[PDB]
Amino acid sequence: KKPVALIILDGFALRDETYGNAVAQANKPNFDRYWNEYPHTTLKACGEAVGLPEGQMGNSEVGHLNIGAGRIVYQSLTRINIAIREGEFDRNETFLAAMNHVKQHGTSLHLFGLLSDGGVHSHIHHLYALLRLAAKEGVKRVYIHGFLDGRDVGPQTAPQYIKELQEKIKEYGVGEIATLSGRYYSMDRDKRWDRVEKAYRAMVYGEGPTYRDPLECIEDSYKHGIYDEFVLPSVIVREDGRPVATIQDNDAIIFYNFRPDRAIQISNTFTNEDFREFDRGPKHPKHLFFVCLTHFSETVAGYVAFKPTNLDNTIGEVLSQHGLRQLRIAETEKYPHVTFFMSGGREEEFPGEDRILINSPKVPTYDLKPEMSAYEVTDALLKEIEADKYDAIILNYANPDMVGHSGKLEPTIKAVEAVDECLGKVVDAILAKGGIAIITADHGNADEVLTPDGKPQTAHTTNPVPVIVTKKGIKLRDGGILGDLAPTMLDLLGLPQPKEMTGKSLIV
Template identity: 55%
Template sequence: MKNIKPLLLIIMDGWGWREERQGNAIALAGTPHLDALKKEYPFTLLRASGEAVGLPEGQMGNSEVGHLNIGAGRIVYQDLTRINLAIKNGTFFENPVLKEAFRAAKKGGGKVHLLGLVSDGGVHSHIEHLYALLAFARKEGLSDRTFVHAFTDGRDTPPTSGITYMKALVNKMQELACGKVATVSGRYYAMDRDKRWERTALAYEALVLGRGLTAPDPVAAIEAAYARGETDEFIKPTVILSGDHPVATIDDQDVVIFFNFRADRARQLTRALTDPDFKEFERKKFPKLAYFVCMTLYDETFDLPVAFPPEHLKNIWGEVVSKAGFYQFRTAETEKYAHVTYFFNGGEEKPFPREERKLIPSPRDVPTYDLKPEMSAYEVTAEVIERIKSGRYHFIVMNYANGDMVGHTGVLEAAIKAVKVVDECVGRVVAAWRQYTDGAPAIVTADHGNCEMMIDPETGEPFTAHTANPVPFYLVDDRFKGASLKEGILGDIAPTGLYLMGLEIPEEMTGQVLLES
């Protein structure tokens, strides 16, 4: 066996690279530990958005996509790109699972309910996919039995852009003469992922019982929310009325198509609507659905039809390390734990042999993370340093959630604090790694941008979304001091990492080694 070296991979979530200082939490905070690495070791920038990570051109990256590409060592074509392509080439309208859903509605006489995030944010859903489903419903002769339960965004899109998307949706429905909006709920309720079931319950009651705030039409629902001081993300579940009755509720024999393509924030509501043994809150009514479609695989344990099942990725980073017989360790706090495990492993839930994991709980004592910008970074750091000292692992993957989660709050001062904490923690982990592994290689990088742009340069308003900026890549390895690195993409990290470790790069990894040969 040639000289195999262990490797540490630190992923700073939501940490893009931007020269301008205005609204740039990273530049304003100052990052002495990262600056020292940049001065002493090779550094480059990686593209983490658009076609470089298998997304449509110009589309900002996100944590899911970022970790998939980093773990796979190649460009992974995202569900968004796959579904867009299917719509473009017409195969979408032949999709057997979607066809079966419409058939079930026709056969049982039930309604079709289209659930999902109504925006073009492209992180969890895309409004064009909803338009395609409406066109499909019309083609199947279900125009007057199709209803949309619209979840408003304001997180991957500007905070009050929801009204624009809603007007566009209403226009599209008129143009197609198909469908009506039945409910409007902010994603905070309909798409919770932190087991705050009381939020999911409010969305469920609007969908199934027609219970909640009411409005005469969907645009009025959003206007009323703005008047109450709620931005899109936080719009309280609102039932649209026709006369004094809900336009539509989900009932026995109905069909539901959840058109979000990202799994993590679709799971809770899906469970509430489909799991007969559900105990998280009391369901006053549990409709016996004719058919429930998940746009993509939301959870291995859901026995539900999937319109676009995952494509299996072979020979990814964790697998190569595992096959070589080494132990590896993955950790992050709750908000990003799925990213260093499930997504890093190509969308597979099961760990590889000799892959160990530890979830560090995210703080539950604050409603939003601007109130606790350090989140659980110190606990993640302490855990990793313990594991480093054990000498057991040849590969450690860790994530700091702060840049992204605090970045999403739009609170610049809090993001500056978050950056300082991450910089300090990275410094401590890298120092411990080098001390206990006798200077083995480390990579410090990021998955996509966010906290480097906290203020919208056009409007001067807080900017809460991800960015399309490149991300930093620090190669900490004494063997390569003074070496120059190519600019690359996230898919180049794994081949580079395997090269530094002295492990063979599998042919499925189409990424490049970033060191200039």
């Protein structure tokens, strides 16, 4: 069994400047030899090249969606942007139905979402559109519960978004910031239900640090070294000390996040009839008209404003269709991208698809353990390779992206070095097995963890990703995009490529 393996170095891109570039500064003997000894090229992993507005950096969802699809996958951010531009956003029946509910049953409208213009999980401009729409629809009571970013934008940038929002609220004549919480608590994706609960109880019970001014809340957090991303779920209160607003029975909630992985958990806490992860308290809110901007999961008992469209014949499906055995492997942090997103937004496994989940280290931030679980993932898979069970393999090494998000150079360099070591073991095992490896990445991050002034850079970059096909004797085209990865794999697998896959094999 000569396996063909697609190895994704999450957040590993190619950038010339070496300043703050942990990818370049790291000692990657393994990666370097393969780059030198095997055919390679770079791919566009951002902007229109992956279904995003021009300029928009890529990410795991977008990245894994496009890699697994073998075509340019139209993204949510773009789609909604167009809706707002074409005046279709204001005609959305789900939004209107939610607005009618609060008006008809005299309740309140609550707006959930990442407060920033990162564009990865949301865009603050989408929130303003809802605020403008709520004002147009005559919705009296509108409350904003913002989740502070600092991961897709500057580490301490919330003040400007809060400011801009406050200005929009005044202009539009509706809205009131009710709570502010770091996305660390309100947008967890590791089933750390303790974090989630914290966000929940601030929102529905008004429990947590209380302030009368959104900005003083932020000022105070920064004062304690707690920045945007990690801001404790706080509650804004009125002159009478009472919370500005708490989610109650029959209230409506519009969660303006369009990325699912970090939205499902809190969405379940709110809509799940029977919920066990933790005790929501006996007086917890019921009968909430819950609206998801896009589809999060079948579990979320709520409506979807922008309904999804099937992604047919993604590599997972073509491999399965041809009786091949495939394995998806990754540690917690990237398990959803190597499975859900890779499979074209599909939850259920394909027949013949196996999955291995390795638990990420039990650390708050991964700068505290740069090697994360890279070693456990390598050992588990090395075993799978010795067994000779799989035809295709999809491995994702989260380290570069996860610790690069810390905005720290040394830890990110350590991370990159840890993965290189692992990468050599994996590819060397593949080759020894007579198989071929496609070493690549979904987008950049670790190529820039410091700003020009030397400050922490906690977000992705727009740099191209590397592409190595460990198959001597071949050449790779150059104007490639992620959507060209799947066709190349099928090419290597010698399987026919579906018409759906509009991408082109990188092999000449």
